[PDB]
Design a protein around this ligand. Structure first.
Ligand SMILES: [Zn+2]
Ligand SMILES: [Zn+2]
Ligand SMILES: [Zn+2]
Length: 109
């Protein structure tokens, strides 16, 4: 199916990013490693990242989002993973504040 196929592909890709983000063997021989490593090296070096429309970083922040939802790794070296977790904490802070606001409106004036 086209559904199972996309999912497979995304999960193979995230698995390869997780590998390549921490791989320190120039002697590594996983076929995907070399290309993913480069994309990861590039992000370390790219200052503008997505705010500046860099097309590589724009693609791996979308990949990291698929990854970060599940990631439990505290010092995760996948590019943008920490950012996506920050963004999620902040959505929750804001949600709590919406809940406070609801109670406050009820008592207001
Ligand atoms: Zn490797
Ligand atoms: Zn970039
Ligand atoms: Zn992560």
């Amino acid at each position: 199916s086209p559904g199972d196929s996309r999912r497979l592909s995304i999960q193979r890709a995230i698995q390869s990013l997780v590998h390549a983000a921490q791989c320190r063997n120039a002697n590594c021989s996983l076929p995907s490693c070399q290309k993913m490593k480069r994309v990861v090296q590039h992000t370390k070096g790219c200052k503008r990242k997505t705010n500046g429309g860099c097309p590589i970083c724009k693609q791996l922040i979308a990949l990291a989002a698929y990854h970060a939802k599940h990631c439990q790794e505290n010092k995760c070296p996948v590019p943008f993973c920490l950012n996506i977790k920050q963004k999620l904490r902040q959505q929750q802070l804001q949600h709590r504040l919406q809940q406070a606001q609801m109670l406050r409106r009820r008592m207001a004036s």
